């Protein structure tokens, strides 16, 4: 019951917070967690698939924005506190922009918003919310909005 081995090579990084994202299996688990949740919400409370794809898209915006663009620092005191003013997203890839891993994280909220709109015939009670998500989630992952804070909110 064990096959398909991969010799995961160790990269530079030297940041325990954002170095686990280079090993094999981080994409196949990001999609598996999104599919597992969808089925878990479609069974515990009997609904329609469209109303299940909207709850999986709204819950994924609250768990990703507070983890990638809110909490600054690292949960390890090993490095004193060198990165005390950098959101996980700004720490990722040692500052590098538009990498192979930064393109996948920016193309996941966009592709997860096209499935929650073409399975609910747009409407208007749910098209608003699903439009506020991507807008606020994709704007923060821009290459220009690096270390910039809006009206000095959470920046010092």
């Amino acid at each position: 019951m064990a096959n398909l081995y991969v010799k995961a090579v160790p990269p530079p990084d030297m940041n325990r917070n954002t170095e686990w994202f280079m090993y094999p299996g981080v994409w196949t688990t990001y999609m598996l967690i999104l599919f597992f949740g969808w089925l878990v919400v479609l069974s515990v409370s009997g609904c329609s698939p469209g109303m299940a794809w909207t709850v999986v898209n709204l819950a994924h915006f609250v768990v990703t924005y507070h983890s990638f663009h809110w909490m600054k620092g690292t949960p390890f005191a090993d490095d004193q506190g060198i990165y005390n003013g950098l959101t996980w997203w700004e720490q990722m890839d040692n500052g590098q922009q538009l990498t192979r891993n930064r393109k996948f994280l920016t193309l996941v909220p966009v592709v997860l918003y096209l499935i929650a709109s073409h399975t609910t015939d747009y409407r208007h009670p749910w098209l608003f919310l699903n439009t506020l998500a991507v807008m606020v989630l994709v704007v923060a992952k821009f290459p220009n909005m690096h270390k910039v804070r809006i009206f000095g909110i959470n920046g010092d």
Partner: peptide
């Protein structure tokens, strides 16, 4: 109102999947 959005994002998706990775600027 249902095809103008799906038709535009596919254009935007191709835009960032072809950009070149670059270092942040210097001091």
């Amino acid at each position: 109102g249902h095809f103008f959005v799906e038709g535009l994002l596919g254009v935007v998706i191709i835009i960032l999947l072809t950009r070149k990775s670059y270092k942040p600027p210097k001091r």
